Design a protein around this ligand. Sequence first.
Ligand SMILES: O=S(=O)(O)OC[C@H]1O[C@@](COS(=O)(=O)O)(O[C@H]2O[C@H](COS(=O)(=O)O)[C@@H](OS(=O)(=O)O)[C@H](OS(=O)(=O)O)[C@H]2OS(=O)(=O)O)[C@@H](OS(=O)(=O)O)[C@@H]1OS(=O)(=O)O
Ligand SMILES: O=S(=O)(O)OC[C@H]1O[C@@](COS(=O)(=O)O)(O[C@H]2O[C@H](COS(=O)(=O)O)[C@@H](OS(=O)(=O)O)[C@H](OS(=O)(=O)O)[C@H]2OS(=O)(=O)O)[C@@H](OS(=O)(=O)O)[C@@H]1OS(=O)(=O)O
Lengths: 200, 200, 101, 101
Amino acid sequence: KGNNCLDAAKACNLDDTCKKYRSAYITPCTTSMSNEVCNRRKCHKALRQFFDKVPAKHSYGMLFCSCRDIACTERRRQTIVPVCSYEERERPNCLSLQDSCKTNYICRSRLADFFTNCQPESRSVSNCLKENYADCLLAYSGLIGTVMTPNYVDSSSLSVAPWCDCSNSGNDLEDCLKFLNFFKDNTCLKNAIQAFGNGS
Amino acid sequence: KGNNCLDAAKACNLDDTCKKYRSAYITPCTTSMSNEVCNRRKCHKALRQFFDKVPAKHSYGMLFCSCRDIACTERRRQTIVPVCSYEERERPNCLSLQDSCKTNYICRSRLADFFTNCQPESRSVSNCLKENYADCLLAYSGLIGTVMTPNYVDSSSLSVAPWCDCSNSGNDLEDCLKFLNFFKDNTCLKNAIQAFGNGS
Amino acid sequence: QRGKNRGCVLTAIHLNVTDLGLGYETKEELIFRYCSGSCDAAETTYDKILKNLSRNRRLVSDKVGQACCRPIAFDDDLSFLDDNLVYHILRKHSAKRCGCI
Amino acid sequence: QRGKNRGCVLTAIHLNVTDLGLGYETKEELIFRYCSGSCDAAETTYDKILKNLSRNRRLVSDKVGQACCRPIAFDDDLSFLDDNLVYHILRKHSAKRCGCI
Ligand SMILES: O=S(=O)(O)OC[C@H]1O[C@@](COS(=O)(=O)O)(O[C@H]2O[C@H](COS(=O)(=O)O)[C@@H](OS(=O)(=O)O)[C@H](OS(=O)(=O)O)[C@H]2OS(=O)(=O)O)[C@@H](OS(=O)(=O)O)[C@@H]1OS(=O)(=O)O
Ligand SMILES: O=S(=O)(O)OC[C@H]1O[C@@](COS(=O)(=O)O)(O[C@H]2O[C@H](COS(=O)(=O)O)[C@@H](OS(=O)(=O)O)[C@H](OS(=O)(=O)O)[C@H]2OS(=O)(=O)O)[C@@H](OS(=O)(=O)O)[C@@H]1OS(=O)(=O)O
């Protein structure tokens, strides 16, 4: 058989634009430095350029492809090159990470679009307050290459989170968890990704 | 048959050094500028480098080859590319030309070697005061690429002169003619050139 | 004048990366493009000399040292994820433009 | 490893300038040097791909788009005086080093 993620890699490599901008990010994201696995800034940059410059039909195919097995979900999880772009020795606190994000024009803007566009509403048919999967996917993919870079965490599901947790939150733990769970347990986002994977 | 000047052109083009430095001077000497036949300075430079950098056996072969016909003597006369390196619209006075020469280190030095080394003495077997054809030829070829650049004038003989005459010399006419005739009627130089052409 | 050596052209083929025999183990794919066709017409001084020397028989042979149809520009880099989830990048593997050289 | 394509070599011939057929009328002479020999061994990614695709039959043919033995450097300029006492200079007319390209 193969899988939908392979098919999306095939389509990308057969398209002049997708192919070029994929290589443009795979390069800095896998080129190790002295005493570091990659240059995270240059990898982040190329990731942003990938999603900004490559039409959604190609760039989303690889990020949001639907899977039936672990060979597929593991390919999908590697799309953003997480060893370089996502993981770090330690997880910062999500409220500190949000603060860092907000000092940066692109991060602040993409983060706000995310909370605005992927707001779940349980009373809606789409399950999204703004009722627009396209704007939620745009907002989510938009975070990739910011300090708020998110990725799939749970290989049996579509669950995502940035690289942060809520350890040592003091009085702000409830706010922290609200922020973190907006990524982890987000019916609007999950439906939007499922919708893209179906072929809407 | 052909001629000795052709043979010397053949030898030169078959030698790495002579070939390269010949082209190095033919180029600037035949490349016309806006409103001028060549850049005389650049042609002069390359001529000096030709005689300084190419061994005498090659560089002299072309300059001093012996001829039996006008096809040979005309080839020999073109060796220094005289249209560029020798001729000018007007002939200056040889005493003015000597003055200009003397303000230049290379010209002053080469000119003195010439008068020293090609001094004719009628009582000698060689007909040279310094009795050394090699030093006279060295001194003469040495002037090529200076303002005192000499060339064959008289296609039926080995007679040479720089590009100057003795018109308007006032009281200095005798000195002027002495200078000019040292090139034109020089038994030491003529013997030295004949000697090279024979194969000494 | 209307273009010497018009027959030197680009051809595209659809391949698995494994078909390239470059040591990779992966299910990923590419378009590979190559340059082929004749370069009989001389486009340089050197090539004119070779052609003229065969014509006048100073070179006892024909087509010796001739130019050939070769890439003069390459397609962009191609990357892929292999079976062990390792990324690779192919460079200068596919032709973008052809010429006689 | 001990040098692929060792057979791609320089050869020198002694010529009249008129033998070149370049339009000149002159009694002058030159050494003309050219590059010839086989380029069967692949020295680049692109060439490895071509060779591998013939081997595994994805290219229904052999030796298509192959490299050839060509100058990778040229001898110095050659000048001469023609029959009408006009000077000329030949450039990039003779090879100094050969390679498969
Ligand atoms: O126009 S935007 O404000 O929307 O910003 C995006 C464009 O600016 C670039 C230009 O890069 S370039 O094409 O390589 O010259 O990036 C530059 O600005 C961003 C954002 O800065 S900002 O203060 O938030 O506005 C910087 O990224 S980041 O530090 O915020 O993460 C770039 O820094 S870096 O190179 O990634 O370190 C900065 O690049 S540069 O210093 O000018 O070279 C492009 O964005 S980017 O490719 O995502 O970095 C955008 O240009 S574009 O023409 O729209 O593609
Ligand atoms: O060492 S010497 O005093 O004997 O002079 C000869 C060397 O100097 C050169 C260097 O040129 S370069 O190799 O291209 O760099 O020429 C330079 O000096 C001469 C003589 O000047 S001087 O004041 O009389 O000593 C200049 O010639 S001239 O103006 O007197 O006719 C050169 O000027 S020009 O380029 O011909 O206009 C001057 O060149 S430069 O400005 O330094 O570039 C070489 O002499 S040359 O090739 O005959 O000009 C000699 O260098 S070498 O390493 O011995 O070959």
